[PDB]
């Protein structure tokens, strides 16, 4: 722990500064340090953790896609052999991405999930666990790909079961979980019909609960409902 000597509060403060500066690798390192202090995370702190690693891995994923696309073209019929470099560099980025995912999954397993008892924390962390196994699945090709997919599915499913029992249908964590699990079905599990059914049912059940919300809660829930609709429009 290179952050072991820094105060928990100072790590959280610096994570917020790193966010303002769009220094997401730093932000993630600060929040990893905060998690490793061993205390549970508040709502704000959980979101700082998630924002940081989502941005880091999101950039890695975008780079991996560029390189994979180049690599596939180099392997078409008619391409001039360019040697091992495209594969090597795609592998380099892939290994770094896998490392970040393993780091996040390790934090969730030691010991964020096991201490998370409230729905808003436990569902949040199990969603993250599904998300980072989903990112591992995006690059997986070996003996382990099915198991990685099933690990993502299992985490999402436990999160879904808790969210349906303990949260209203407009809860933004519940909505974002369903959005992402629907994408898992479409893009990872080769289950587009499940993806579409989940997005549509989630949208409709949220619609019917909007009347209970304040203006600020309404704005948050309708934002993610619009993402559900966006995906449905892409898929139908």
């Amino acid at each position: 722990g290179a952050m072991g000597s820094m105060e928990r509060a100072s790590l959280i403060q610096k994570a917020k500064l790193a966010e303002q500066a769009e220094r997401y690798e730093d932000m993630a390192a600060f929040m990893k340090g905060a998690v490793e202090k061993g205390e549970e995370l508040s709502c704000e702190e959980r979101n700082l953790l998630s924002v940081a690693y989502k941005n880091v891995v999101g950039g890695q994923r975008a780079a991996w896609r560029v390189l994979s696309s180049i690599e596939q073209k180099s392997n078409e019929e008619g391409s001039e052999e360019k040697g091992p470099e495209v594969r090597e560099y795609r592998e380099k980025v892939e290994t770094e991405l896998q490392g970040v995912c393993d780091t996040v999954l390790g934090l969730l397993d030691s010991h964020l999930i096991k201490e998370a008892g409230d729905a808003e924390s436990r569902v949040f962390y199990l969603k993250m666990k599904g998300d980072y196994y989903r990112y591992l699945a995006e690059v997986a090709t070996g003996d382990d790909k099915k198991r990685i997919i099933d690990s993502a599915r299992s985490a999402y499913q436990e999160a879904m079961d808790i969210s349906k029992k303990e949260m209203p249908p407009t809860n933004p964590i519940r909505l974002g979980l369903a959005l992402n699990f629907s994408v898992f079905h479409y893009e990872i599990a080769n289950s587009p019909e499940e993806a579409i059914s989940l997005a549509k049912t989630t949208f409709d059940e949220a619609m019917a609960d909007l009347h209970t919300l304040s203006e600020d809660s309404y704005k948050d829930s309708t934002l993610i409902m619009q993402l559900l609709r966006d995906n449905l429009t892409l898929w139908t």
Partner: peptide, 5 residues
């Protein structure tokens, strides 16, 4: 790509 959050 589809939207995730």
């Amino acid at each position: 790509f589809p939207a995730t959050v």
